[PDB]
Amino acid sequence: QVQLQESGPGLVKPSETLSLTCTVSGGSVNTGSYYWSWIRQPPGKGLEWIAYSSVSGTSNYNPSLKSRVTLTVDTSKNQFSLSVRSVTAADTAVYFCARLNYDILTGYYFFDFWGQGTLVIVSSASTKGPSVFPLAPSSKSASGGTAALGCLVKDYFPEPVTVSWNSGALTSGVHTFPAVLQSSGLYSLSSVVTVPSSSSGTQTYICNVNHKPSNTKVDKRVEPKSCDKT
Amino acid sequence: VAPLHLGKCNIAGWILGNPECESLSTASSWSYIVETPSSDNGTCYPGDFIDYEELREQLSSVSSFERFEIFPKTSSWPNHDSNKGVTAACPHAGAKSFYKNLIWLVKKGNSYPKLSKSYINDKGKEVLVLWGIHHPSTSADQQSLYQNADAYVFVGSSRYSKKFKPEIAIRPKVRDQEGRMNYYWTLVEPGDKITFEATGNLVVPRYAFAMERNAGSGIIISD
Amino acid sequence: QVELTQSPSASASLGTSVKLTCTLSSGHSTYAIAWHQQRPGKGPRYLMNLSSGGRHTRGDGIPDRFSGSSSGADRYLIISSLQSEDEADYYCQTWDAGMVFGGGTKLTVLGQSKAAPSVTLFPPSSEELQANKATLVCLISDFYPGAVTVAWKADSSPVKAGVETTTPSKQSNNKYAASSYLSLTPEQWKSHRSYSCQVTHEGSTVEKTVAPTECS
Ligand SMILES: *[C@@H]1O[C@H](CO)[C@@H](O)[C@H](O)[C@H]1NC(C)=O
Ligand SMILES: [Ca+2]
C-alpha cells in the first residue's frame, strides 16, 4: 500500500541548490498523525536526519542544516520537497524520503516507511554518458550446459546507471555487477545474462541502459553472432 | 452560620492549594467568606484564573463541602511523571513545589502518550473540578516538558466542552516564569462524566470538591 | 539532546540468536527507540519500536524472530534463528529535540558453505575495436569467502599495466562477486595469441582464456 519515492537530479555543482521531491502513494500527506521527512546517508557512512514538516503542524530541523534547508508540501499532487542551498562535496549522499509516525497513543516518533533513496553527487565535474558495447557469447559456453552474453557500459559519470533486459521482461539469469572506478574518474560496468545455449540465434536479447544525469537511454541488441558479422 | 477564614490567602490560593494555604483548608460548612483581597498567595505560577468571579459567588456560601481525591496521585498516571511537576514559583519551605489540588504532569523520558481520564460524579452533590493549562515560553520548553510540539488538551462534561492548545511565547518574567498557566473549572452534575484527554500541557486535577451550594448569595469580605 | 552509540560490527553463526546493542547517552536511560534494517544498497526498513522497560512492537510484516529488550541505558535487538538474509546494517533511532540515529552495526552472518568462484571472460567487442579501443572483462561471481586475488596473463607471462579490479561485494544470491577490466589498444590485443584472467580463491585457481582474430 504505502510507498514513497524520491526524485531529482543525480548531480549538482558546488554552491548551487539541491532540490528533491518525494511522491507518496497508498496514503495522503494531509491525513494522519504523520510528518514527512528527509534523511541522507553519505557514501559508506550512517543515516543523518535532515528535517520534517507536516501539512498543518510544526516543522523540525537538524540544527546544523536548518539555515540551508526549506521544506514544502504539495497537498494536491501528494508530494513533499526538500531544498538545500549552497551545496558542497560534503552534501554528496543518498537522500531518502520517509514517513515519520507520531503514534499518538505511545508518544513515539518512528520512521515506518522509507523511500528507495536517490543519490546526489556534488561535483564541479560535468556529466559523461556511457558507451555501450555487446559481449557476444563464445563457443566454449555453448556445448553441453549453459552460455553467457552481456553488455559493457564503459566510461560514464556520475553513478548510477540502470540496466534491464528485454525492456523489463528478463530477470532470472541476469546479474548486473557493481561498477569499477578507473584512474580517469569514470565508471564502467557490465551486465551478464546466463542463458540456454540454444546457439542463441533468434532468441532475442537486448540490454537497456539508462544513465539519467546525461539523458542517455540506449538499447544495444546483443547480436549473439560471436564476432562473425560480415 | 460560621464563616470561612482564609488568612493571608484569597479564594484562588485556597481552592487551588497554594502551599502557603494549607493551615486552614477544609471547614465543613459556611455562610460567608473572609479573605485577603489581592494577596499574592493566590496563583504562584503566573497566569489567568478563568471564570474567577463566577467561582467566588459559587463558593461564597455552602451547605456542605467535602474534598476528595478524584484522580489519586499514585494510580491514575502510570505513563506520565507525576513528580517533576514542581517550580520555584511555588516554593514550599526549602524545596520547589506546586499546588496541592492539581498535578503538573510531564513526560516520562522521551514520550508523552495520549492520556485520557474520566470521572463520573457518584457523590450525589455537585462536584467542583479545577484544572490547569500550561503555556510554555519556547518550543524547547514544550519539547522538554511534553515532547509533543503539536499537543492539545480536551476537557468535557455533558454541559462543558473545550479544546485548548498552548500559545507558546516569551512573556514578561513573573516569579522567574516566562511561560504562563491558566486555571479553569467546572461543576459536574450528579451522574455526569467529566473527561480529560491530553497529549501535553495539562495540569490535571488531583483533588476535587463535592459541594451543596446555598440559596442566593454569600458574601466575600476582605481585610 | 540524546545520542545513540552502537559498536560498528557484529558476527554470529546461522541458526543462533544474535543480540545487537544500542546505548543511550548518560541521562537518557528512560528513552524509547526504534530499530531499522538496511540490507546492502537498499533503503532502510522499520523493524520495531522499543520501550525503556523492554516492550517491543514490530512493524508490519517483520517476522516473529525479531524482538527487543532493555537493560538500563542499553536497548537490544534480538534476532533469533539467524538467517543469511539478516546480513545487514541495523540502525537504532530515537527522538528528543530532533530525530537521532545510531551509527549502525553491520551484522555478518557466518556458517555458509565455501563456494569457488565462477569466472566468465569476454574479449573485446567488434564494435569497441572499431572505435580504436579494446577491453577484456573478467566477471567473477558466486564465491564465499570474499578473498579473491586476480591475475592477468598475456600469452603466458604477467600483465602489469591496464588492469582495474572491483573490491568484492555480497549479492542477491548471498555470495560474493567482482569485475576485473583490462584496457588495451587493439594493436596490443592483437600482439598476443591469448590473454587469460586467473582468479585464485582459497589457494585454488580458476582460469579462463580468450584469443583474437579468427572471426570475419
Ligand atoms: C506568598 O506571599 C508572599 C508575599 O505576599 C510572597 O513573597 C511569597 O512568595 C508567596 N508564596 C507563595 C508560595 O505563593
Ligand atoms: Ca464553567
Residue numbers in the entry:
A (entry chain H): 1 to 230
B (entry chain A): 64 to 286
C (entry chain L): 2 to 217
Task: Please give the exact wording used by the authors of the publication that reports this structure.
The full-length HA can be divided into two regions, the hemagglutinin head domain (HA1) and hemagglutinin stalk domain (HA2), and it may form a trimer via HA2. In this study, we isolated the human antibody 32D6, which is specific to the H1N1 influenza virus A/California/7/2009, and showed that 32D6 is effective in neutralizing several different isolates after the 2009 pandemic (also known as swine flu).
The crystals belong to space group P3112 with four 32D6-Fab/HA1 complexes packed into an asymmetric unit. In the complex structure, one Fab is bound to the top of each globular HA1 domain. The 32D6-binding site displays a conformational epitope located on the top surface of HA. The major region is composed of two discontinuous linear peptides (residues 172 to 177 and residues 206 to 213) form an abreast loop conformation, and the residues T262 between two loops to form a conformational epitope for 32D6 recognition. In light-chain CDRs, the residues A32, T94, W95, and D96 are hydrogen bonded to the residues N173, Q206 and Q210 in HA. Three water molecules were observed at the interface of HA and the heavy chain. Another water molecule was used to mediate the interaction between G107 in the heavy-chain CDR3 and N211 on HA. In the 32D6-Fab complex structure, the glycosylated N104 with a monosaccharide is observed on a SDNGT sequon to stabilize the protein structure of HA1 domain, along with the glycan contact with the side chains of K71, N81, and R238.
